[PDB]
Amino acid sequence: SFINYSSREINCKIVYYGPGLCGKTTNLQYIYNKTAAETKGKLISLSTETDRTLFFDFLPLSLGEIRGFKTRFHLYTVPGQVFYDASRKLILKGVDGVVFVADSQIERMEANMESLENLRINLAEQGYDLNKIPYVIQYNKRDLPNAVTVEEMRKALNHRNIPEYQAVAPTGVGVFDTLKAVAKLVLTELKKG
Ligand SMILES: Nc1nc2c(ncn2[C@@H]2O[C@H](COP(=O)(O)OP(=O)(O)O)[C@@H](O)[C@H]2O)c(=O)[nH]1
Protein backbone atom coordinates (compact mmCIF):
# COMPACT_ATOMS: atom_id res chain seq x y z
CA SER A 1 0.00 0.00 0.00
CA PHE A 2 1.01 3.65 -0.51
CA ILE A 3 0.06 6.39 1.95
CA ASN A 4 -0.43 9.78 0.28
CA TYR A 5 -0.29 12.45 2.99
CA SER A 6 -1.35 15.26 0.64
CA SER A 7 -4.67 13.70 -0.34
CA ARG A 8 -4.87 11.75 2.95
CA GLU A 9 -5.41 8.46 1.13
CA ILE A 10 -4.26 4.89 1.67
CA ASN A 11 -3.87 3.49 -1.85
CA CYS A 12 -4.28 -0.29 -2.08
CA LYS A 13 -3.71 -2.59 -5.05
CA ILE A 14 -5.86 -5.65 -5.75
CA VAL A 15 -4.70 -7.96 -8.54
CA TYR A 16 -7.10 -10.30 -10.34
CA TYR A 17 -5.05 -13.34 -11.39
CA GLY A 18 -5.82 -16.41 -13.45
CA PRO A 19 -5.30 -18.17 -16.78
CA GLY A 20 -6.27 -16.73 -20.13
CA LEU A 21 -10.02 -16.29 -20.74
CA CYS A 22 -11.02 -17.21 -17.19
CA GLY A 23 -12.95 -13.98 -16.56
CA LYS A 24 -10.67 -11.28 -15.14
CA THR A 25 -11.64 -8.58 -17.65
CA THR A 26 -15.30 -9.45 -17.06
CA ASN A 27 -14.95 -9.08 -13.28
CA LEU A 28 -13.32 -5.66 -13.58
CA GLN A 29 -15.81 -4.54 -16.26
CA TYR A 30 -18.81 -5.46 -14.12
CA ILE A 31 -17.30 -3.81 -11.03
CA TYR A 32 -16.55 -0.64 -12.99
CA ASN A 33 -19.97 -0.40 -14.63
CA LYS A 34 -21.79 -0.67 -11.28
CA THR A 35 -19.50 1.76 -9.42
CA ALA A 36 -20.78 5.30 -8.88
CA ALA A 37 -19.31 7.63 -11.49
CA GLU A 38 -18.29 10.26 -8.93
CA THR A 39 -16.13 7.75 -7.01
CA LYS A 40 -14.24 6.02 -9.85
CA GLY A 41 -11.52 7.16 -12.21
CA LYS A 42 -10.96 6.19 -15.81
CA LEU A 43 -11.06 2.54 -16.86
CA ILE A 44 -7.81 1.96 -18.75
CA SER A 45 -7.03 -0.96 -21.06
CA LEU A 46 -3.49 -1.52 -22.37
CA SER A 47 -3.71 -3.92 -25.32
CA THR A 48 -1.36 -5.50 -27.83
CA GLU A 49 -1.99 -7.83 -30.76
CA THR A 50 -2.06 -10.83 -28.38
CA ASP A 51 -2.76 -9.65 -24.81
CA ARG A 52 -4.16 -6.89 -22.62
CA THR A 53 -4.23 -5.49 -19.10
CA LEU A 54 -7.18 -3.70 -17.51
CA PHE A 55 -7.09 -1.43 -14.48
CA PHE A 56 -8.87 1.39 -12.65
CA ASP A 57 -9.21 2.90 -9.18
CA PHE A 58 -12.10 4.00 -7.02
CA LEU A 59 -12.85 5.57 -3.64
CA PRO A 60 -15.54 3.47 -1.89
CA LEU A 61 -18.01 6.15 -0.78
CA SER A 62 -19.34 3.79 1.89
CA LEU A 63 -16.39 2.73 4.00
CA GLY A 64 -15.30 4.75 7.02
CA GLU A 65 -11.89 6.34 7.45
CA ILE A 66 -8.81 4.77 9.02
CA ARG A 67 -6.97 7.23 11.28
CA GLY A 68 -8.38 10.11 9.24
CA PHE A 69 -7.34 8.60 5.90
CA LYS A 70 -9.75 7.36 3.25
CA THR A 71 -8.96 4.22 1.27
CA ARG A 72 -8.54 4.12 -2.51
CA PHE A 73 -8.61 0.75 -4.29
CA HIS A 74 -6.72 0.09 -7.53
CA LEU A 75 -7.90 -3.01 -9.42
CA TYR A 76 -5.59 -4.65 -11.98
CA THR A 77 -5.99 -7.63 -14.25
CA VAL A 78 -2.93 -9.53 -15.44
CA PRO A 79 -1.89 -10.55 -18.98
CA GLY A 80 -2.56 -14.14 -19.96
CA GLN A 81 -0.01 -15.06 -22.62
CA VAL A 82 2.94 -17.21 -21.57
CA PHE A 83 5.48 -14.59 -22.71
CA TYR A 84 4.35 -11.71 -20.43
CA ASP A 85 5.45 -13.22 -17.10
CA ALA A 86 7.69 -10.22 -16.42
CA SER A 87 4.62 -7.99 -16.75
CA ARG A 88 2.75 -10.18 -14.27
CA LYS A 89 5.67 -9.88 -11.86
CA LEU A 90 5.65 -6.11 -12.27
CA ILE A 91 1.93 -5.98 -11.58
CA LEU A 92 2.33 -8.07 -8.42
CA LYS A 93 4.99 -5.78 -6.90
CA GLY A 94 3.47 -4.07 -3.87
CA VAL A 95 0.22 -6.03 -4.12
CA ASP A 96 -2.07 -5.76 -1.10
CA GLY A 97 -4.73 -8.30 -2.04
CA VAL A 98 -5.10 -10.99 -4.69
CA VAL A 99 -8.15 -12.59 -6.30
CA PHE A 100 -7.56 -15.84 -8.17
CA VAL A 101 -10.24 -16.27 -10.84
CA ALA A 102 -10.57 -19.96 -11.73
CA ASP A 103 -12.24 -21.14 -14.95
CA SER A 104 -14.58 -23.85 -13.65
CA GLN A 105 -14.55 -25.71 -16.98
CA ILE A 106 -12.97 -29.14 -16.63
CA GLU A 107 -10.94 -28.51 -19.81
CA ARG A 108 -9.30 -25.56 -18.03
CA MET A 109 -8.45 -27.08 -14.63
CA GLU A 110 -4.83 -27.83 -15.56
CA ALA A 111 -4.66 -24.21 -16.84
CA ASN A 112 -5.95 -23.06 -13.46
CA MET A 113 -3.38 -25.20 -11.67
CA GLU A 114 -0.62 -23.71 -13.79
CA SER A 115 -1.69 -20.11 -13.22
CA LEU A 116 -2.01 -20.67 -9.47
CA GLU A 117 1.55 -21.98 -9.28
CA ASN A 118 2.70 -19.09 -11.46
CA LEU A 119 1.10 -16.76 -8.91
CA ARG A 120 2.75 -18.54 -5.96
CA ILE A 121 6.25 -18.59 -7.47
CA ASN A 122 5.97 -14.96 -8.52
CA LEU A 123 4.92 -13.83 -5.05
CA ALA A 124 7.64 -16.02 -3.54
CA GLU A 125 10.18 -14.26 -5.76
CA GLN A 126 9.24 -10.94 -4.16
CA GLY A 127 9.34 -12.47 -0.68
CA TYR A 128 5.65 -13.10 0.01
CA ASP A 129 3.60 -16.20 0.79
CA LEU A 130 0.25 -16.61 -0.97
CA ASN A 131 -1.06 -18.30 2.18
CA LYS A 132 -0.16 -15.33 4.41
CA ILE A 133 -1.49 -12.38 2.35
CA PRO A 134 -5.07 -11.18 1.68
CA TYR A 135 -6.27 -13.70 -0.88
CA VAL A 136 -9.60 -15.13 -2.04
CA ILE A 137 -10.45 -17.49 -4.89
CA GLN A 138 -13.38 -17.25 -7.31
CA TYR A 139 -14.79 -20.28 -9.13
CA ASN A 140 -16.13 -18.54 -12.23
CA LYS A 141 -18.36 -19.85 -15.05
CA ARG A 142 -20.70 -21.87 -12.83
CA ASP A 143 -23.37 -21.48 -15.52
CA LEU A 144 -21.54 -23.73 -17.97
CA PRO A 145 -22.52 -27.43 -18.23
CA ASN A 146 -18.89 -28.61 -18.06
CA ALA A 147 -18.28 -26.82 -14.73
CA VAL A 148 -16.38 -28.90 -12.18
CA THR A 149 -17.94 -29.50 -8.78
CA VAL A 150 -16.83 -27.11 -6.05
CA GLU A 151 -15.35 -29.96 -3.97
CA GLU A 152 -12.94 -31.07 -6.70
CA MET A 153 -12.00 -27.49 -7.59
CA ARG A 154 -11.26 -27.04 -3.88
CA LYS A 155 -9.16 -30.21 -3.74
CA ALA A 156 -7.13 -28.91 -6.70
CA LEU A 157 -6.95 -25.14 -6.12
CA ASN A 158 -7.80 -24.33 -2.47
CA HIS A 159 -6.27 -26.96 -0.18
CA ARG A 160 -5.75 -24.57 2.76
CA ASN A 161 -9.41 -23.42 2.63
CA ILE A 162 -9.04 -19.68 2.06
CA PRO A 163 -12.27 -17.76 1.28
CA GLU A 164 -13.89 -18.95 -1.94
CA TYR A 165 -16.80 -17.58 -3.96
CA GLN A 166 -18.80 -18.91 -6.91
CA ALA A 167 -19.51 -16.56 -9.79
CA VAL A 168 -21.10 -15.98 -13.16
CA ALA A 169 -19.12 -12.84 -13.93
CA PRO A 170 -20.98 -11.52 -17.03
CA THR A 171 -24.25 -11.38 -15.08
CA GLY A 172 -22.55 -10.15 -11.88
CA VAL A 173 -23.24 -13.17 -9.66
CA GLY A 174 -20.51 -13.41 -7.01
CA VAL A 175 -18.48 -10.48 -8.38
CA PHE A 176 -19.03 -7.98 -5.58
CA ASP A 177 -18.98 -10.70 -2.91
CA THR A 178 -15.44 -11.58 -4.01
CA LEU A 179 -14.43 -7.92 -4.10
CA LYS A 180 -15.90 -7.26 -0.64
CA ALA A 181 -14.12 -10.29 0.82
CA VAL A 182 -10.64 -9.39 -0.43
CA ALA A 183 -11.18 -5.72 0.46
CA LYS A 184 -12.18 -6.68 4.00
CA LEU A 185 -9.04 -8.78 4.40
CA VAL A 186 -6.91 -5.89 3.11
CA LEU A 187 -8.57 -3.39 5.47
CA THR A 188 -8.13 -5.72 8.44
CA GLU A 189 -4.42 -5.87 7.60
CA LEU A 190 -4.37 -2.07 7.29
CA LYS A 191 -5.71 -1.73 10.84
CA LYS A 192 -2.68 -3.62 12.21
CA GLY A 193 1.09 -3.97 11.69
N1 LIG B 1 -20.60 -18.54 -19.75
C1 LIG B 1 -19.71 -17.74 -19.10
N2 LIG B 1 -18.81 -17.04 -19.84
C2 LIG B 1 -17.91 -16.23 -19.24
C3 LIG B 1 -17.92 -16.12 -17.77
N3 LIG B 1 -16.94 -15.26 -17.44
C4 LIG B 1 -16.33 -14.86 -18.60
N4 LIG B 1 -16.92 -15.44 -19.66
C5 LIG B 1 -16.54 -15.27 -21.08
O1 LIG B 1 -15.21 -15.75 -21.26
C6 LIG B 1 -14.52 -14.96 -22.23
C7 LIG B 1 -13.20 -14.49 -21.66
O2 LIG B 1 -13.48 -13.67 -20.53
P1 LIG B 1 -12.42 -12.54 -20.13
O3 LIG B 1 -12.94 -11.71 -18.98
O4 LIG B 1 -12.13 -11.68 -21.33
O5 LIG B 1 -11.14 -13.45 -19.76
P2 LIG B 1 -9.76 -12.89 -19.16
O6 LIG B 1 -8.62 -13.23 -20.09
O7 LIG B 1 -9.46 -13.59 -17.85
O8 LIG B 1 -9.85 -11.40 -18.95
C8 LIG B 1 -15.41 -13.77 -22.53
O9 LIG B 1 -15.96 -13.99 -23.83
C9 LIG B 1 -16.51 -13.81 -21.50
O10 LIG B 1 -17.77 -13.41 -22.05
C10 LIG B 1 -18.94 -16.90 -17.05
O11 LIG B 1 -19.03 -16.86 -15.80
N5 LIG B 1 -19.78 -17.67 -17.76
Author numbering: 2 to 194
Per the authors:
The ability of MglA to hydrolyze GTP is essential for motility regulation.
Remarkably, we trapped MglA in a mixed state in which switch 1 is in the inactive conformation and switch 2 is in the active conformation, an inactive/active combination never observed in a small GTPase before. There is no Mg2+ in this structure, as its binding site is occluded by the retracted switch 1. Structures of small GTPases with bound GDP-Pi have shown that this state retains the conformation of the GTP-bound precursors. The observation that the mixed MglA conformation observed in the crystal contains GDP and Pi raises the possibility that the MglB-refractory MglA species is a post-hydrolysis intermediate resulting from spontaneous hydrolysis of GTP into GDP-Pi. However, analysis of the nucleotide content of MglB-resistant MglA samples showed that the major bound nucleotide was GTP. Several lines of evidence suggest that the MglA-GTP* species identified biochemically and in vivo corresponds to the mixed inactive/active conformation seen in the crystal: (1) considering that all known crystal structures of small GTPases bound to GDP-Pi retain the conformation of their GTP-bound precursor, and that the mixed structure, although it contains GDP-Pi, can readily accommodate GTP, it is likely that the mixed structure derives from a GTP-bound MglA species with the same mixed conformation.
